[PDB]
Homo-oligomer: A and B are copies of this chain.
Amino acid sequence: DGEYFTLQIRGRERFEQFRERNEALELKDAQAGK
């Protein structure tokens, strides 16, 4: 098993920022990070 987190938003104008960021940040950790 393991643990994680989850965020919810009711605005599409803001989501576009997180979603797109999710991909960018996803690479930040998946690659190096230390």
Q: Which of A's residues lie within 8 Å of B, judged by CB? A: 2-15, 17-19, 21-22, 25-26, 28-29, 33
Contacts and interface: CB of A to CB of B under 8 A. Distances in A.
B12 A5 contact: yes
Contacts of A7: 6-9, 15, 18-19, 22
Number of copies of this protein chain within its complex: 2
Contacts of A14: 22, 25-26, 28-29
Contacts of A28: 13-14, 17
Given A6-B7, A13-B33, 5 more contacts: A4-B11, A7-B22, A9-B26, A13-B29, A14-B29
A28 B2 CA distance: 33
